[PDB]
Amino acid sequence: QHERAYHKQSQIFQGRFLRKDNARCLRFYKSIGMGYHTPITAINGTYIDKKCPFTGNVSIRGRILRGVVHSAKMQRSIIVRRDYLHFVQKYKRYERRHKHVAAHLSPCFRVKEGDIVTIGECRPLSKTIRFNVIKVEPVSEARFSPF
Amino acid sequence: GGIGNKFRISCGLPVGAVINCADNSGAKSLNMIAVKNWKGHLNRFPKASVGDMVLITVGRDGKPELRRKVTPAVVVRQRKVWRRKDGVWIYFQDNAGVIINPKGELKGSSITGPVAKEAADRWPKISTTAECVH
Amino acid sequence: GITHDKMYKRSKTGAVQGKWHKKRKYNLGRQPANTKLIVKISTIRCRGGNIKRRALRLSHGSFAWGSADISHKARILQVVYNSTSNELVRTNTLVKGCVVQIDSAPFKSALSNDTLDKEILDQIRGDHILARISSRPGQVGTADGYILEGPELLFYQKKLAPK
Amino acid sequence: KSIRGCIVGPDLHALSVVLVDAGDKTLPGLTDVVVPKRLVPKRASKIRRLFGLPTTDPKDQMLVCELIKELGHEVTLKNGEKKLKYPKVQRVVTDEK
RNA sequence: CAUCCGGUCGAUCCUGCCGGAGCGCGACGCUCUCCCCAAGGACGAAGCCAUGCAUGCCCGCUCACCCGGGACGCGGCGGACGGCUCAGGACAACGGUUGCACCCCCCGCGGCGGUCCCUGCUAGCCGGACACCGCUGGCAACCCGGCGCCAAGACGUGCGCGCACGGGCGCGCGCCCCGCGGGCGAGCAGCGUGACGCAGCGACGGCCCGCCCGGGCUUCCGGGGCAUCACCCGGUCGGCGCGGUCGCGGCGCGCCGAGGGCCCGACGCCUGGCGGAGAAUCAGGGUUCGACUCCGGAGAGCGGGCCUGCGAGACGGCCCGCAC
RNA sequence: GACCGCAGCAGGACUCCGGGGUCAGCAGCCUCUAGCGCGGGAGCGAACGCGGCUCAGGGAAGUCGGCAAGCCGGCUCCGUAACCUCGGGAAAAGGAGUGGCUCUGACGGCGCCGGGUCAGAACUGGAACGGACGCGGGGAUCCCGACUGUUUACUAGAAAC
């Protein structure tokens, strides 16, 4: 046991695994609002996550935005690249512009770089992470896309 | 400009001593060029005690105007222990001095740290300006 | 002058931020009251004038056994496994999530009882029922906890194992 | 602020002292003189206690008065019109109370 | 609110600037017959300041003088708003747009109001006591020492519904999800039941909840120049556990990873940088200025630290270093 | 230990073998084995000398000149400029720690047995730790010679060769 501390989902009481082998609930699969279906990977998954969008104690309140995954190299977190056009007024022309949003990728969905994801606003969960991934729309094996 | 007949006290600061500034005049360190009222003897470096007017030069530490000139100063603190005739043997942590004209006016408005009674009795302006006489 | 402002920190790019205002009282932090365990609850006036209780030294707490539904005050004998700092274990500081040995005497009667598991009934005889504190004594002024039950116990027994 | 020390010294130019037990000789200014108290109790529970109402219902009119007319009336020559200088009785139960 | 004209030549046609010509906003000169309105120590001196004045009001309690007026005192409420300036600050402020299921709030307004035992309590009703003041004072000043008298809606106690009751602590939905609520786009609230703690406030009983206003953070977009700044950061980027806070979060601390940002210009440097609503000029598209009038920010010589507070890291509060 | 220098002269003489502890060390310091008590002894504790110590306050004012002495030094981690033939400079300059205990971690062969190094933490001791020992003071320039080398045995080690 190399983990300094045990990890327990807060919603389920520890004396449920010990006995009552017959029934009860040992995992809390809360369903997110805004017409997004809690995935079965969360329903049957073994992950804990305090900041998981579905099982964990987090609420998706505020806006919901979509972006491509610039990076998946932190622990259960991704950076979503947002590509948009900003219109400069004097020149009747737009500028391609980019902003990077840090989001929490819960272990339920699987994300590889280059995939569309939906990120929903959450209570600040880190210095930079104020958004939690709700959905992943996987793209092909391999441009500027405004989502 | 010294007021009174001082009793002799042990002189701990010979020529070459770099005494610290005790005033806000702008000098940080003062080098002792020479001692006033000194008829020396052969080979004896001129030596000075607390309350004794000395001629000093200000080193590269000091403000530019103060530098490059022989200026009058009084030693207000000495590390060497000295015996007042009352029998007290007193010494201060550092050797420090105040830039003053021979008349008695001081270049800097403020004096820092304790100042010896010997300086303050001999020079009245020293007594008024200094926070503590010890 | 302890503060929880983000102005003092760097930007996400590592760029030094510039300071626009002086320290504010609303953005204030307080010296941590590591709660020593004896082998006094201070009152502090917070924002809004609300008074939060800070336990500095607290002897016992309302520990509980949920599966057997028996919950009694018990004495905190000793602190084991802080999980953040080993220094806190040997100074017997009280934080939430702090495993602790409560005296088995209030729960001694249940030893006669049976069917409430078997491992937890063995602890009743020893005088050492393991229990994690559930309340932040610095903020809530109380050290009420819960006896470790089931796998959490097995993990915290393996951690505490004599090796 | 600068405050003098608890231990007494030659420096103090003034000291203060409370005579407790004393010698037989009466002090020329202290033991002989007896200062009249300027005022009297106004709290009713104290006023009932002063007249020993507990020793022997709301007293109401047991209250005493300086009886010395009214303050600020000497120039008006209202000295003959002597109001009862009753200290106002406070803590007294009333029927309104 | 679509306009040109003078100047290189010996002449000419150009390019191209120079100069005029218009309109503001300030200085200077000279000159102003009267009235109406109106700006007015901002401009690399947020330099320094003599003096005067800018926050009082109130009567809960009233045995000096004067009458119903009380002075002084204690107590309350306010002094955090206002007035002032633009130094600092360039993913900051500021604007438009979100959220707080992560929150604090005086007043006022509307609800609601049960307060454990047990010892000792007085509940027609409790103490003892401080200031003013009486006396007796030191001190250059500033500042205040003792000893006694004695009030509060002040102070400390305090009886009072074991559906007693603050905080916090347990156990209390799921069978793939979503299709009802006290409710919600959202498993949120409330309660039951365990145990803890005795939180309120009661000496002219009122906690508490709401709404308001005012916060605190927060989401997205917009948010100066300089490459004679090309790589940058190292709580920096994430995880996890605690602590702290009104709460959230590297906010702090351990621990564990190795991220995070960038030629769509990161980072560094610089500014005679407060931002917006706006102002000037003015076919159109624009250019320039954003001191100041309203709004938001910031600051009270320069840094720190606090106390009182419902709210201030307050400076016509305090403490300390610095500079004068 | 008898050679060769006047001699049974702190002069000069080529090898072989080479334990322990502290240590990076065949260094310094102390020792096991082995050897062994040196042109004599006693007394005294003057000046002066020679070999060493320590010194208040100042800090090269001494002197032809910092001569001589002192300062610095081991290790570990940071932190290092001008210049430059890009190799250096550089141990630049400048800091901080260091003991004794009590324990943790890592690193192998693989029933089980090494290794002595590396970290990290308590806790302690007049405010102490390379505790003796060993063991750069540093920097800014000018001249000359590029350097490493060689040199007047017995007054010149240099810029000379």
From TrEMBL, chain A:
This is Ribosomal protein S11. CDD domains: Ribosomal_uS17. Belongs to the universal ribosomal protein uS17 family. It comes from Giardia intestinalis (strain ATCC 50803 / WB clone C6). Keywords: Ribonucleoprotein, Ribosomal protein. InterPro entries: NA-bd_OB-fold, Ribosomal_uS17, Ribosomal_uS17_arc/euk, Ribosomal_uS17_CS, Ribosomal_uS17_N. One of its GO terms (cellular component) is cytosolic small ribosomal subunit. GO terms for molecular function: structural constituent of ribosome. It holds the Pfam family Ribosomal_S17_N. GO terms for biological process: translation. It comes from the Eukaryota.
UniProtKB/TrEMBL annotation, chain B:
One of its GO terms (biological process) is translation. It holds the Pfam family Ribosomal_L14. Keywords: Metal-binding, Ribonucleoprotein, Ribosomal protein. Signal peptide: none annotated. GO terms for molecular function: large ribosomal subunit rRNA binding; structural constituent of ribosome. Mg(2+) binds at residue 43. GO terms for cellular component: cytosolic large ribosomal subunit. It comes from the Eukaryota. This is Ribosomal protein L23.
From TrEMBL, chain C:
It comes from the Eukaryota. The keyword Transcription does not apply. Keywords: Ribonucleoprotein, Ribosomal protein. GO terms for biological process: maturation of SSU-rRNA from tricistronic rRNA transcript (SSU-rRNA, 5.8S rRNA, LSU-rRNA); translation. It comes from Giardia intestinalis (strain ATCC 50803 / WB clone C6). This is 40S ribosomal protein S8. Belongs to the eukaryotic ribosomal protein eS8 family. NCBIfam families: eS8. One of its GO terms (cellular component) is cytosolic small ribosomal subunit. InterPro entries: Ribosomal_eS8, Ribosomal_Se8/biogenesis_NSA2.
Automatic annotation (TrEMBL), chain D:
Belongs to the eukaryotic ribosomal protein eS6 family. This is 40S ribosomal protein S6. It comes from Giardia intestinalis (strain ATCC 50803 / WB clone C6) (Giardia lamblia). The lineage of its organism: Eukaryota, Metamonada, Diplomonadida, Hexamitidae, Giardiinae. The chain holds residues 101 to 199 of 248 of the full protein.
